Design a protein around this ligand. Structure first.
Ligand code: A1JEF
Length: 339
């Protein structure tokens, strides 16, 4: 299909040009006013900030250099910055600035005020199948783009999918994304979403993203994920077992798609066969989807989040507000030379 082939051909050209020549050091901390902490966790902190000269709002991610305990954490944060400054796609949050100082690394991204898909899912209870299909189509197109660049995403989960002013998805957190020619081996990802070959410490590939899409569609349509338990070891036992139970309200087409995405044998899993992403796009559950219309954002969304303005934080939750301290002396300079 030639218009698709040439689209992805140009996508890859434009990615490689930025990949081979990353930008660095494009602002500093005292160019911004701090407003509110939007989240804190294994990813560091994300704060709402306002640019003093333009008045524009941004989401600033702050990483503390000295909390590194493993060399793979350094590699992961360098992956994230280099990939984000090189990609361009309608459903990916855009990186606007990056920089570092004596104590921290900073990635300054567009601010999306509608909140996390996770909050809206837990408030509504479950999404109808048309609503879940609207969000799933956007992830299918995003993985078609990323995989064609030889990138694997490895952190799909509802907390990472923000809802924008038009009710469409923006994917955030490239902390585990990586450029991969064949296989890769790191143990990473949230337990509920891990594919069997990650749990079994095998060399793995882009098929782990299509497994995670199966978990995400099930969770959107049921209201809970297919494999859960109080201990990760119990979660892992269900994931590798080859057994999943579907609610009776699931359509027959939905069950059939999920059995093919949640296929424990990676050589039989949809997205990883000879026809690649088209086994998914041509499946009966997507028969009503206009793929070009979704890409061009011409489809009316299932709902628009309620918010008052580009600086409204009411769709995020409350965290203890802590200092952003920047030591008199530099820490960990060499290890982060490339940032
Ligand atoms: C990339 N790492 C941070 C590495 C690091 C950097 C500096 C210091 C300590 C550690 C975070 C993970 O990315 C995806 C996942 N949602 C999040 O846990």
């Amino acid at each position: 299909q030639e218009s698709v082939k040439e689209f992805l051909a140009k996508a890859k050209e434009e990615f490689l040009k930025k990949w081979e020549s990353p930008s660095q050091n494009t602002a500093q901390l005292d160019h911004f006013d701090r407003i509110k902490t939007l989240g804190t966790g294994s990813f560091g902190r994300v704060m709402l900030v306002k640019h003093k000269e333009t008045g524009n709002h941004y989401a600033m991610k702050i990483l503390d250099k000295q909390k590194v305990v493993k060399l793979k954490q350094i590699e992961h944060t360098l992956n994230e910055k280099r990939i984000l400054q090189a990609v361009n796609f309608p459903f990916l949050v855009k990186l606007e600035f990056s920089f570092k100082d004596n104590s921290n690394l900073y990635m300054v991204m567009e601010y999306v005020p509608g909140g996390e898909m996770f909050s809206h899912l837990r408030r509504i209870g479950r999404f109808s199948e048309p609503h879940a299909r609207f969000y799933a189509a956007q992830i299918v197109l995003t993985f078609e783009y990323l995989h064609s660049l030889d990138l694997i995403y490895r952190d799909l989960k509802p907390e990472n999918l923000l809802i924008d002013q038009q009710g469409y998805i923006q994917v955030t957190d490239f902390g585990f994304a990586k450029r991969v020619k064949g296989r890769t081996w790191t143990l990473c990802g949230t337990p509920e979403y891990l594919a069997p070959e990650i749990i079994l410490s095998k060399g793995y590939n882009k098929a782990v993203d299509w497994w995670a899409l199966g978990v995400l569609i099930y969770e959107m349509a049921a209201g809970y994920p297919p494999f859960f338990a109080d201990q990760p070891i119990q979660i892992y036992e269900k994931i590798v077992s080859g057994k999943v139970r579907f609610p009776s309200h699931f359509s027959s087409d939905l069950k059939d798609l999920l059995r093919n995405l949640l296929q424990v044998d990676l050589t039989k899993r949809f997205g990883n066969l000879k026809n690649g992403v088209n086994d998914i796009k041509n499946h009966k559950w997507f028969a009503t989807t206009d793929w070009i219309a979704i890409y061009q954002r011409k489809v009316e969304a299932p709902f628009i989040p309620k918010f008052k303005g580009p600086g409204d934080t009411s769709n995020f939750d409350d965290y203890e507000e802590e200092e952003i301290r920047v030591s008199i002396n530099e820490k960990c300079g060499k290890e982060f030379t490339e940032f």
